[PDB]
């Protein structure tokens, strides 16, 4: 309908619809849908993303790392009037924005392994405030990094602070990456600030042939 | 999300009507065929038939045909069912359904259930 | 009509073993290469719920279930049983109107 496959994939609250959607045989995205990115920024490698779609039929979600485990970061105030849900301010649901806890971001380590038999799409984000101002208000650290881990895997992400236009009221940014994570390797994240967490990860159930077809209608037909 | 908001809990007289209704919510009402099923208190669900709102085409089961009368409401998002001259054989549950994709799908959404009750 | 006929009709079986229901269809159930078998879990007390599509894909289903089958006969396979698994499950065809479901098979947990 109205979503875009990052917005569908992220988890916008505007794509509810699709919280945990069945097999498919192809898959509908309008040329320009509304529901995309709620808080403005990246995707990296997205087109490669939707090409990995194209060749795949089932995604079965599943919690990566329960919102529930973040005991020393606050995982209920990652929320912007950008990402709206029933009129108040929300996030992308299967992705946490992780603040700060009693003026204190302590050092995450979280690790997960892949048991599954099959590949799975593990998506997470950075963040890019306004100022250094923002910067110590959201996590109280001033110097942050991310950094991934995996067999094949390996990145430090450092956030960018610059001064942006207003998008969707947010001058801040938000950028997201994602990997395949082999069936019996592991992911590993470590962070200190600006890190937007993974909830929900999908297992690629059945690859096949199918395809992104860009079109503005909606049959009951076969 | 997919909500399905359907009438309340009914008692009729036998030989008379009812008329439980069910409001879509969610998505895009014309998109989907909309149905309804019967189950006999804990035993066997049976379909009855199924309405698509788009146009108001319909498709009943054998033996409904009769009792039975699915409409639309396209303003309101809603689906109505009617069924005439009850009998003790109806009194059981009835669940307003969103099937996915017409003659060959599967029910994905269920409703809650509006249940009735035949006495006098 | 496609007389579906589960079996067996109530199923007892251990905590943290197999639940094993089957389904048989009068004729098959069976074309486009597909099985167009479903199963269906009713929790007591409320609607029934959908698990399996086309015999063998789970739809949030976790995987404890094992949708198995082809053509005539079909399986339900639930291992391990947990606590919140007691339902009565329902097999139904789509294959051809009238649509038809199978008797139920209710399931009980030995504690």
């Known amino acids: 309908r109205d979503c875009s496959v990052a917005g569908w994939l992220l988890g916008n609250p505007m794509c509810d619809e699709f919280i945990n959607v069945p097999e498919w045989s192809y898959i509908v995205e309008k040329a320009s849908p509304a529901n995309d990115l709620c808080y403005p920024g990246d995707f990296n490698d997205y087109e490669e993303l939707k090409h990995l779609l194209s060749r795949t039929n089932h995604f079965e979600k599943i919690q990566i790392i329960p919102k529930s485990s973040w005991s020393n970061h606050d995982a209920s105030s990652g929320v912007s009037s950008a990402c709206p849900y029933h009129g108040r301010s929300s996030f992308f649901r299967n992705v946490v924005w992780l603040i700060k806890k009693n003026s204190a971001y302590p050092t995450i380590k979280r690790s997960y392994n892949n048991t599954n038999q099959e590949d799975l799409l593990v998506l997470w984000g950075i963040h890019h405030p306004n100022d250094a101002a923002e910067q110590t208000k959201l996590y109280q650290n001033p110097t942050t990094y991310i950094s991934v881990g995996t067999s094949t895997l390996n990145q430090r992400l450092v956030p960018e602070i610059a001064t942006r236009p207003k998008v969707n009221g947010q001058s801040g940014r938000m950028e997201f990456f994602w990997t395949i994570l082999k069936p019996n390797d592991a992911i590993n994240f470590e962070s200190n600030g600006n890190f937007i967490a993974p909830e929900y990860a999908y297992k690629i159930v059945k690859k096949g042939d199918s395809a992104i077809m860009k079109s503005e209608l909606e049959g009951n037909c076969n | 999300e997919v909500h399905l908001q359907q009438s309340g809990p009914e008692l009729v007289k036998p030989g008379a009507s009812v008329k439980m209704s069910c409001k879509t919510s969610?998505?895009?009402?014309?998109?989907?065929?909309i149905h309804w099923m019967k189950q006999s208190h804990g035993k066997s669900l049976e379909w009855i038939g199924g309405?698509?709102?788009?146009?108001?085409?319909?498709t009943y089961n054998q033996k409904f045909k009769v009792r039975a009368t699915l409409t639309v409401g396209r303003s309101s998002s809603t689906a109505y069912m009617d069924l005439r001259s009850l009998t003790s054989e109806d009194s059981a549950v009835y669940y307003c359904?969103?099937?996915?994709?017409?003659?060959?799908?599967?029910?994905?959404?269920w409703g809650a259930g509006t249940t009735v009750t035949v006495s006098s | 009509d496609i007389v579906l006929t589960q079996s067996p009709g109530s199923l007892t079986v251990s905590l943290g073993q197999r639940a094993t229901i089957s389904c048989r269809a009068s004729e098959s159930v069976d074309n486009f290469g597909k099985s167009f078998m479903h199963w269906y879990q009713q929790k007591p007390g409320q609607s029934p719920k959908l698990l399996i599509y086309?015999?063998?894909n789970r739809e949030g289903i976790p995987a404890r279930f094992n949708g198995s089958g082809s053509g005539t006969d079909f399986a339900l396979t639930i291992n391990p049983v947990e606590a919140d698994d007691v339902a009565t499950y329902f097999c139904q065809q789509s294959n051809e109107d009238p649509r038809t479901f199978g008797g139920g098979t209710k399931l009980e947990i030995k504690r």
């Open positions: 309405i698509f709102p788009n146009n108001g085409d319909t």
């Open positions: 359904v969103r099937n996915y994709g017409s003659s060959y799908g599967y029910f994905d959404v």
């Open positions: 969610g998505y895009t009402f014309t998109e989907y065929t």
């Open positions: 086309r015999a063998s």
